[PDB]
Tab-separated table of C-alpha atoms in Angstrom:
chain	number	residue	atom	x	y	z
G	2232	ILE	CA	13.322	8.212	-13.642
G	2233	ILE	CA	16.070	10.224	-15.231
G	2234	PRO	CA	19.047	7.242	-17.159
G	2235	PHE	CA	22.874	8.145	-16.080
G	2236	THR	CA	24.713	10.736	-17.847
G	2237	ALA	CA	29.195	9.854	-18.136
G	2238	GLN	CA	29.110	12.851	-16.159
G	2239	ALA	CA	26.774	11.258	-13.486
G	2240	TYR	CA	29.003	8.086	-13.738
G	2241	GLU	CA	32.235	9.695	-13.833
G	2242	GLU	CA	30.825	12.015	-10.360
G	2243	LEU	CA	29.492	8.451	-8.463
G	2244	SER	CA	33.216	6.948	-9.759
G	2245	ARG	CA	35.109	9.669	-8.146
G	2246	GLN	CA	32.467	9.416	-5.052
G	2247	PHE	CA	33.206	5.456	-4.666
G	2248	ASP	CA	37.755	5.793	-6.130
G	2249	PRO	CA	38.499	5.458	-2.804
G	2250	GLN	CA	36.713	0.983	-2.057
G	2251	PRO	CA	38.311	-0.992	-5.059
G	2252	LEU	CA	34.759	-3.408	-4.093
G	2253	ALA	CA	32.439	-0.298	-4.719
G	2254	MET	CA	34.499	0.378	-8.335
G	2255	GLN	CA	34.843	-3.024	-8.997
G	2256	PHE	CA	30.552	-2.898	-8.425
G	2257	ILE	CA	29.632	-0.275	-10.911
G	2258	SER	CA	32.305	-1.529	-13.203
G	2259	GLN	CA	30.002	-3.897	-14.094
G	2260	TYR	CA	27.140	-1.503	-14.363
G	2261	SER	CA	26.306	0.873	-18.335
G	2262	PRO	CA	25.221	4.492	-17.021
G	2263	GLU	CA	22.243	3.457	-18.970
G	2264	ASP	CA	21.454	0.384	-16.133
G	2265	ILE	CA	21.917	3.186	-13.505
G	2266	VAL	CA	19.246	5.177	-13.173
G	2267	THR	CA	18.192	7.642	-10.731
G	2268	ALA	CA	14.210	7.605	-9.608
G	2269	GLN	CA	13.889	11.250	-8.456
G	2270	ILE	CA	10.996	9.827	-5.267
G	2271	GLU	CA	9.347	13.317	-4.854
G	2272	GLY	CA	9.251	14.224	-1.397
G	2273	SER	CA	5.712	15.266	-0.642
G	2274	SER	CA	3.395	12.073	-0.015
G	2275	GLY	CA	1.962	11.279	-3.876
G	2276	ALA	CA	-1.282	10.453	-1.812
G	2277	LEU	CA	-2.806	11.858	1.576
G	2278	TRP	CA	-3.113	10.133	4.168
G	2279	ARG	CA	-6.682	8.183	4.777
G	2280	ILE	CA	-5.745	6.821	8.516
G	2281	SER	CA	-8.777	6.674	10.617
G	2282	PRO	CA	-9.080	8.750	13.795
G	2283	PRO	CA	-8.907	5.382	16.250
G	2284	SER	CA	-5.701	4.207	13.702
G	2285	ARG	CA	-4.463	7.471	14.495
G	2286	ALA	CA	-4.933	7.585	18.628
G	2287	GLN	CA	-3.786	3.686	18.531
G	2288	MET	CA	-0.792	5.332	16.251
G	2289	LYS	CA	0.199	8.018	18.531
G	2290	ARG	CA	-0.802	5.301	21.949
G	2291	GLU	CA	1.156	3.117	20.588
G	2292	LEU	CA	4.471	5.924	19.880
G	2293	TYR	CA	4.328	7.114	23.054
G	2294	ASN	CA	3.162	3.832	25.427
G	2295	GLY	CA	3.706	1.106	23.653
G	2296	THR	CA	6.749	-0.975	25.145
G	2297	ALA	CA	6.793	-2.820	22.213
G	2298	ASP	CA	9.122	-1.964	19.538
G	2299	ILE	CA	6.655	-0.024	16.495
G	2300	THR	CA	8.097	-1.421	12.835
G	2301	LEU	CA	9.475	1.610	10.261
G	2302	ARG	CA	8.567	-0.225	7.067
G	2303	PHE	CA	10.838	1.238	4.008
G	2304	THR	CA	9.901	-0.860	0.888
G	2305	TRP	CA	10.535	-0.304	-2.722
G	2306	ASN	CA	9.480	-2.066	-5.408
G	2307	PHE	CA	10.856	-1.087	-9.318
G	2308	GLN	CA	8.306	-2.178	-12.172
G	2309	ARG	CA	9.378	-3.139	-15.410
G	2310	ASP	CA	8.776	-3.415	-18.805
G	2311	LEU	CA	8.235	-7.309	-20.090
G	2312	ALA	CA	8.248	-5.958	-23.860
G	2313	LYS	CA	11.956	-5.584	-23.579
G	2314	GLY	CA	12.157	-9.136	-21.604
G	2315	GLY	CA	13.326	-10.747	-18.622
G	2316	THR	CA	10.871	-13.025	-16.310
G	2317	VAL	CA	10.164	-10.955	-13.898
G	2318	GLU	CA	7.470	-7.715	-14.167
G	2319	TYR	CA	8.488	-6.585	-10.637
G	2320	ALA	CA	11.197	-6.442	-8.383
G	2321	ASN	CA	10.607	-5.412	-4.714
G	2322	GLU	CA	12.604	-5.765	-1.470
G	2323	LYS	CA	12.227	-4.561	2.233
G	2324	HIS	CA	14.257	-2.256	5.081
G	2325	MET	CA	12.717	-2.302	8.770
G	2326	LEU	CA	14.057	-0.609	11.197
G	2327	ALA	CA	12.849	-1.368	15.074
G	2328	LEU	CA	11.584	2.134	17.022
G	2329	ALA	CA	12.682	0.903	20.527
G	2330	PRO	CA	10.881	2.207	23.077
G	2331	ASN	CA	11.107	5.212	24.255
G	2332	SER	CA	14.197	6.597	21.755
G	2333	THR	CA	14.804	10.716	20.673
G	2334	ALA	CA	12.819	9.108	16.746
G	2335	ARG	CA	10.074	7.399	18.016
G	2336	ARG	CA	8.943	10.008	20.925
G	2337	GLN	CA	9.271	13.456	17.828
G	2338	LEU	CA	7.235	11.577	16.054
G	2339	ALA	CA	4.780	11.076	18.410
G	2340	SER	CA	5.634	14.853	18.818
G	2341	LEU	CA	4.707	15.293	15.255
G	2342	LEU	CA	1.275	14.040	15.271
G	2343	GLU	CA	0.516	16.947	17.571
G	2344	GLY	CA	0.335	19.301	14.759
G	2345	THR	CA	1.169	21.366	17.737
G	2346	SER	CA	6.124	21.039	16.216
G	2347	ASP	CA	6.922	22.766	13.330
G	2348	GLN	CA	9.613	20.406	13.718
G	2349	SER	CA	11.789	17.648	11.761
G	2350	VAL	CA	12.015	14.038	13.277
G	2351	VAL	CA	14.994	12.519	11.910
G	2352	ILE	CA	15.384	9.046	11.447
G	2353	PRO	CA	18.822	7.930	10.617
G	2354	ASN	CA	19.812	4.496	8.751
G	2355	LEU	CA	16.176	4.448	6.803
G	2356	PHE	CA	17.303	5.061	3.033
G	2357	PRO	CA	19.855	2.073	1.192
G	2358	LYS	CA	20.536	4.958	-1.460
G	2359	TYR	CA	22.116	2.000	-3.701
G	2360	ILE	CA	20.016	-0.970	-4.762
G	2361	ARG	CA	20.079	-3.345	-7.222
G	2362	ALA	CA	17.182	-4.530	-9.398
G	2363	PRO	CA	18.446	-8.005	-10.455
G	2364	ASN	CA	16.673	-10.315	-12.817
G	2365	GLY	CA	14.796	-12.096	-9.891
G	2366	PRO	CA	12.396	-10.153	-7.830
G	2367	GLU	CA	14.370	-9.535	-4.317
G	2368	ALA	CA	15.783	-5.614	-5.142
G	2369	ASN	CA	18.177	-6.316	-2.463
G	2370	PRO	CA	20.599	-3.191	-1.118
G	2371	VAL	CA	24.575	-2.329	-3.086
G	2372	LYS	CA	26.110	-4.129	0.019
G	2373	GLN	CA	29.459	-2.987	-2.211
G	2374	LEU	CA	28.912	0.608	-2.174
G	2375	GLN	CA	26.897	-0.434	1.416
G	2376	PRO	CA	29.385	-2.040	3.702
G	2377	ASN	CA	27.812	-0.974	6.736
G	2378	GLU	CA	24.165	-2.263	4.959
G	2379	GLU	CA	22.494	-0.497	7.205
G	2380	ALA	CA	24.739	2.785	8.697
G	2381	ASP	CA	25.208	2.895	5.326
G	2382	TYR	CA	21.926	4.062	4.818
G	2383	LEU	CA	20.579	7.362	4.448
G	2384	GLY	CA	19.273	9.516	7.012
G	2385	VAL	CA	16.019	10.025	6.666
G	2386	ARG	CA	13.848	13.692	8.038
G	2387	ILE	CA	10.174	13.007	8.350
G	2388	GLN	CA	8.455	15.764	8.537
G	2389	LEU	CA	3.429	15.964	8.839
G	2390	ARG	CA	1.769	18.535	6.716
G	2391	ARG	CA	-1.492	19.422	8.245
G	2392	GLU	CA	-3.587	21.958	5.597
G	2393	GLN	CA	-6.818	22.641	7.894
G	2394	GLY	CA	-7.677	25.094	6.013
G	2395	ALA	CA	-7.804	27.773	9.290
G	2396	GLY	CA	-11.246	25.652	10.439
G	2397	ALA	CA	-12.102	23.320	12.182
G	2398	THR	CA	-10.678	19.916	11.999
G	2399	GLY	CA	-10.613	19.212	8.114
G	2400	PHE	CA	-7.007	18.508	8.158
G	2401	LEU	CA	-5.921	17.171	4.517
G	2402	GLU	CA	-2.968	15.104	6.289
G	2403	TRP	CA	0.089	13.916	4.042
G	2404	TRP	CA	4.136	13.427	5.125
G	2405	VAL	CA	6.927	15.160	3.538
G	2406	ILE	CA	10.418	13.169	2.957
G	2407	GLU	CA	13.376	14.717	2.944
G	2408	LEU	CA	17.086	13.337	3.085
G	2409	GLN	CA	19.127	15.103	6.326
G	2410	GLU	CA	21.874	15.884	4.047
G	2411	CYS	CA	20.285	17.101	1.247
G	2412	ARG	CA	21.834	21.015	-0.048
G	2413	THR	CA	20.204	21.174	-3.420
G	2414	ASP	CA	16.425	19.457	-4.228
G	2415	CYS	CA	15.490	18.516	-0.421
G	2416	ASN	CA	12.016	17.836	-2.836
G	2417	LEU	CA	13.364	14.792	-4.238
G	2418	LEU	CA	14.961	11.080	-2.883
G	2419	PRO	CA	17.599	10.475	-5.014
G	2420	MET	CA	17.538	6.376	-5.308
G	2421	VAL	CA	20.752	5.052	-7.464
G	2422	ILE	CA	19.148	2.145	-9.187
G	2423	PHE	CA	21.102	-0.845	-10.597
G	2424	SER	CA	19.257	-2.953	-13.320
G	2425	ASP	CA	20.712	-6.315	-14.952
L	2232	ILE	CA	-0.117	-13.688	8.282
L	2233	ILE	CA	-0.218	-15.916	11.232
L	2234	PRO	CA	1.301	-19.980	9.859
L	2235	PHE	CA	-0.574	-22.797	11.687
L	2236	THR	CA	1.114	-24.323	14.906
L	2237	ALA	CA	0.664	-27.461	15.160
L	2238	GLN	CA	-1.766	-26.906	17.980
L	2239	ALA	CA	-3.616	-24.729	15.370
L	2240	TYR	CA	-3.014	-27.682	12.997
L	2241	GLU	CA	-4.194	-29.881	16.089
L	2242	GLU	CA	-7.798	-27.643	16.522
L	2243	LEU	CA	-8.660	-27.585	13.388
L	2244	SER	CA	-8.577	-31.758	13.442
L	2245	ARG	CA	-10.095	-31.701	16.214
L	2246	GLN	CA	-12.993	-29.448	14.760
L	2247	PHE	CA	-13.253	-31.510	11.604
L	2248	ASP	CA	-13.120	-35.269	13.168
L	2249	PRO	CA	-17.170	-35.884	11.921
L	2250	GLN	CA	-16.764	-34.827	8.905
L	2251	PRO	CA	-14.413	-37.465	6.951
L	2252	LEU	CA	-14.453	-35.667	4.358
L	2253	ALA	CA	-12.930	-32.456	6.011
L	2254	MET	CA	-9.954	-34.584	7.602
L	2255	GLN	CA	-9.004	-36.248	4.115
L	2256	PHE	CA	-9.206	-32.840	2.613
L	2257	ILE	CA	-6.766	-31.222	5.776
L	2258	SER	CA	-4.416	-34.364	6.240
L	2259	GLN	CA	-3.213	-32.826	2.627
L	2260	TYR	CA	-1.856	-30.064	4.310
L	2261	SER	CA	1.304	-29.175	7.168
L	2262	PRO	CA	0.514	-26.514	9.289
L	2263	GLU	CA	3.760	-24.564	7.371
L	2264	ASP	CA	0.739	-24.585	4.464
L	2265	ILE	CA	-1.678	-23.546	6.015
L	2266	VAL	CA	-1.730	-19.986	7.536
L	2267	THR	CA	-4.671	-18.303	9.167
L	2268	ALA	CA	-4.927	-14.144	7.333
L	2269	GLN	CA	-5.076	-12.062	9.935
L	2270	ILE	CA	-7.191	-9.359	8.562
L	2271	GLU	CA	-8.082	-6.322	11.030
L	2272	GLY	CA	-11.897	-5.706	10.053
L	2273	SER	CA	-10.797	-1.695	10.587
L	2274	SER	CA	-10.656	-0.830	6.507
L	2275	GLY	CA	-7.201	0.222	5.860
L	2276	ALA	CA	-8.906	3.120	3.391
L	2277	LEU	CA	-11.066	6.123	3.909
L	2278	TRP	CA	-14.248	5.947	2.100
L	2279	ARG	CA	-13.956	8.580	-0.620
L	2280	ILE	CA	-17.172	7.488	-2.644
L	2281	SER	CA	-18.635	11.055	-3.698
L	2282	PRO	CA	-21.100	12.524	-2.778
L	2283	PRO	CA	-23.485	12.237	-5.337
L	2284	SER	CA	-21.974	7.657	-5.545
L	2285	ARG	CA	-23.463	7.932	-2.751
L	2286	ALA	CA	-26.490	9.890	-3.313
L	2287	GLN	CA	-26.909	6.501	-5.674
L	2288	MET	CA	-25.728	4.588	-3.981
L	2289	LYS	CA	-28.451	4.811	-0.692
L	2290	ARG	CA	-31.353	5.343	-3.629
L	2291	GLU	CA	-30.470	2.330	-5.249
L	2292	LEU	CA	-30.479	0.090	-1.526
L	2293	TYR	CA	-33.874	1.831	-0.463
L	2294	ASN	CA	-35.744	2.332	-3.920
L	2295	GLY	CA	-34.033	0.307	-6.431
L	2296	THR	CA	-36.189	-2.972	-7.981
L	2297	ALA	CA	-32.558	-4.378	-9.281
L	2298	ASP	CA	-30.520	-6.639	-6.499
L	2299	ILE	CA	-27.224	-5.381	-5.484
L	2300	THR	CA	-24.714	-7.506	-5.717
L	2301	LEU	CA	-22.830	-7.610	-2.318
L	2302	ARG	CA	-18.921	-9.004	-4.350
L	2303	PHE	CA	-16.403	-9.835	-1.009
L	2304	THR	CA	-13.304	-10.460	-2.984
L	2305	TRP	CA	-9.794	-11.937	-1.965
L	2306	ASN	CA	-6.272	-11.838	-4.023
L	2307	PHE	CA	-3.254	-13.367	-2.598
L	2308	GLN	CA	0.521	-11.849	-4.091
L	2309	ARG	CA	3.245	-15.201	-3.504
L	2310	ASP	CA	6.593	-14.858	-3.510
L	2311	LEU	CA	8.074	-15.427	-7.408
L	2312	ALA	CA	11.382	-16.324	-5.904
L	2313	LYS	CA	10.736	-19.580	-3.994
L	2314	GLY	CA	9.092	-20.303	-7.242
L	2315	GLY	CA	5.578	-21.288	-9.027
L	2316	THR	CA	4.426	-18.888	-12.320
L	2317	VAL	CA	1.352	-17.278	-11.293
L	2318	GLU	CA	1.974	-14.203	-8.568
L	2319	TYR	CA	-1.252	-13.712	-7.203
L	2320	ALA	CA	-4.059	-16.155	-7.058
L	2321	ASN	CA	-7.732	-14.468	-6.672
L	2322	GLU	CA	-11.203	-15.108	-6.274
L	2323	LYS	CA	-14.850	-13.710	-5.837
L	2324	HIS	CA	-17.523	-14.212	-3.712
L	2325	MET	CA	-20.418	-12.175	-5.026
L	2326	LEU	CA	-24.494	-12.580	-3.031
L	2327	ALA	CA	-27.659	-11.008	-4.397
L	2328	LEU	CA	-28.387	-8.286	-1.338
B	2377	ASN	CA	-22.612	-26.552	2.171
B	2378	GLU	CA	-21.063	-23.851	-0.047
B	2379	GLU	CA	-22.384	-20.779	0.439
B	2380	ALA	CA	-24.651	-21.872	3.675
B	2381	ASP	CA	-21.255	-22.496	5.812
B	2382	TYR	CA	-20.014	-19.598	5.107
B	2383	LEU	CA	-19.606	-16.107	8.219
B	2384	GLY	CA	-22.246	-14.194	8.648
B	2385	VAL	CA	-20.336	-10.863	8.436
B	2386	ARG	CA	-21.535	-7.576	10.659
B	2387	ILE	CA	-21.530	-4.318	8.567
B	2388	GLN	CA	-20.886	-1.306	10.735
B	2389	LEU	CA	-19.655	2.441	9.306
B	2390	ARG	CA	-17.591	4.560	11.192
B	2391	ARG	CA	-18.229	8.282	10.196
B	2392	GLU	CA	-15.669	10.562	12.171
B	2393	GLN	CA	-16.747	14.249	11.607
B	2394	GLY	CA	-15.354	15.560	14.394
B	2395	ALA	CA	-18.272	17.411	15.865
B	2396	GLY	CA	-19.336	19.903	13.373
B	2397	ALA	CA	-19.840	20.905	9.903
B	2398	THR	CA	-19.811	18.058	7.339
B	2399	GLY	CA	-16.902	16.848	6.717
B	2400	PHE	CA	-16.987	12.412	7.006
B	2401	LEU	CA	-13.641	10.380	7.757
B	2402	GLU	CA	-15.997	7.768	6.525
B	2403	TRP	CA	-14.942	3.866	6.904
B	2404	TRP	CA	-16.559	0.993	6.757
B	2405	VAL	CA	-15.766	-1.875	10.062
B	2406	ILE	CA	-16.321	-5.185	9.396
B	2407	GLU	CA	-17.161	-7.809	12.496
B	2408	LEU	CA	-17.338	-11.617	11.859
B	2409	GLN	CA	-21.082	-12.575	13.468
B	2410	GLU	CA	-19.830	-14.954	15.664
B	2411	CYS	CA	-16.717	-13.162	17.703
B	2412	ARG	CA	-16.216	-13.422	20.952
B	2413	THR	CA	-12.052	-13.425	21.131
B	2414	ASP	CA	-10.328	-10.751	18.290
B	2415	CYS	CA	-13.920	-8.643	17.212
B	2416	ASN	CA	-11.598	-6.026	15.177
B	2417	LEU	CA	-9.614	-9.609	13.391
B	2418	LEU	CA	-10.979	-11.827	10.772
B	2419	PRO	CA	-9.237	-15.298	10.813
B	2420	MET	CA	-8.801	-16.103	6.565
B	2421	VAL	CA	-7.810	-20.232	6.928
B	2422	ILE	CA	-5.392	-20.082	3.918
B	2423	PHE	CA	-4.265	-24.085	1.924
B	2424	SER	CA	-1.388	-23.258	-0.338
B	2425	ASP	CA	-0.364	-25.681	-2.601
T	2377	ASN	CA	-5.298	10.126	-38.797
T	2378	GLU	CA	-4.301	8.207	-35.196
T	2379	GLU	CA	-4.142	11.502	-32.742
T	2380	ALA	CA	-6.898	13.521	-34.499
T	2381	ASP	CA	-8.534	10.524	-34.712
T	2382	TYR	CA	-9.321	10.678	-31.133
T	2383	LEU	CA	-11.965	11.321	-29.628
T	2384	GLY	CA	-11.916	14.969	-27.940
T	2385	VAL	CA	-12.574	14.370	-23.728
T	2386	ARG	CA	-14.656	17.468	-21.848
T	2387	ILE	CA	-13.166	17.273	-18.494
T	2388	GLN	CA	-15.887	18.980	-15.063
T	2389	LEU	CA	-14.655	19.809	-12.165
T	2390	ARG	CA	-16.875	18.468	-9.381
T	2391	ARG	CA	-16.896	20.057	-6.250
T	2392	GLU	CA	-18.906	18.896	-3.446
T	2393	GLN	CA	-18.701	21.426	-0.095
T	2394	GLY	CA	-21.667	20.773	2.289
T	2395	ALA	CA	-22.268	24.933	1.900
T	2396	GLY	CA	-19.481	25.629	4.548
T	2397	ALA	CA	-16.082	25.900	5.592
T	2398	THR	CA	-13.142	24.734	3.364
T	2399	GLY	CA	-13.687	20.455	3.472
T	2400	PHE	CA	-13.512	20.395	-0.422
T	2401	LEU	CA	-14.748	16.591	-1.804
T	2402	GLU	CA	-12.706	17.232	-4.087
T	2403	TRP	CA	-13.166	15.041	-7.362
T	2404	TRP	CA	-13.427	14.830	-11.766
T	2405	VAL	CA	-15.779	13.968	-13.755
T	2406	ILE	CA	-14.823	13.609	-17.759
T	2407	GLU	CA	-17.493	12.732	-20.713
T	2408	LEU	CA	-17.197	12.564	-24.254
T	2409	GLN	CA	-17.570	15.581	-26.293
T	2410	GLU	CA	-19.529	14.372	-28.187
T	2411	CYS	CA	-21.964	12.731	-25.726
T	2412	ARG	CA	-25.799	12.277	-26.869
T	2413	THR	CA	-26.312	8.633	-24.382
T	2414	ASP	CA	-25.017	7.816	-21.255
T	2415	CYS	CA	-22.804	10.259	-20.828
T	2416	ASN	CA	-21.572	9.672	-18.088
T	2417	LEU	CA	-20.099	6.487	-19.689
T	2418	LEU	CA	-16.722	6.068	-22.225
T	2419	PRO	CA	-17.343	3.354	-24.762
T	2420	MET	CA	-13.938	2.491	-24.774
T	2421	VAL	CA	-13.577	-0.715	-27.433
T	2422	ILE	CA	-11.005	-3.458	-26.641
T	2423	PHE	CA	-9.927	-6.133	-29.760
T	2424	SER	CA	-8.817	-8.357	-27.225
T	2425	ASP	CA	-6.319	-11.434	-29.348
């Protein structure tokens, strides 16, 4: 969790100078109120999915007629000794992965472990999030005026350490931003804390 | 987490119609206040247990002279933005095996 | 009857092995003793104030 | 003496393998440097207001 430097605040200001509603929003926050959470793109936990749950998820991705909801959640723990009445501010994005969609089939082929192919899921990562004094961590509609259409595409990969032998599969997911150029192992979430 | 339909509330009412204390309790709650948590019966986590902890648990189940406490716990997270002062309501049942 | 009106739980150990070695993907399954439909679900009825 | 009165911790890596492959059930064990009885326990003394 890195607070904005005066340079990062000038760079965000120069990024949003064309949107007067975005500049009106940015100008309400100090460089100390805006933090970049550098979220590491490798899952900090092994994917402990039961073999029947994984087989069911594979069947639901390939053959499921219902929309499979991809839920991205963020939850911000705050210091109650710094004040406020709410320790946790959280919210969720929810993409419906439509039956027969390209993303749903590519996330199904990742589960086979036969492809070095990443799935790209558009519209999944809100880069700009407000953390208000309440419990609801809403995305910044002033910086993302098209809401879901201004959310960054996430490239998802399945890493599968095997150890060249048996079915012992240390499996975990990696996420990257679709447009990563530097630090593809980091997902910079820009959080405006009230 | 599924809220009670008017049908599920009538079905619970018909289940407890013989117990006047149960009907007096059910009648204090609306169908929206009663929720069925459909808890999936497969553990959402792999049982990591260390091999020596599993060997100790196996020894304590077979050869342990003390009661081994089977603790069932439930913990309900609530929306603080809907009001109330307590995010987490929890309790435990404890059977002595 | 407090404890005597609590439902019996049928517990199972699922042990994916992968037919080889001691790699044991182990997890517990719980079912209600009287499950008839949806034995994979434990309906807990919660009265929220 | 703040940090200088904090107990030394002996750390170990336990690595159940099952004598075969690279299936490594790995976990850390911590002990107090001066443990004499109950080396499997770290007694933290907490003064609750």
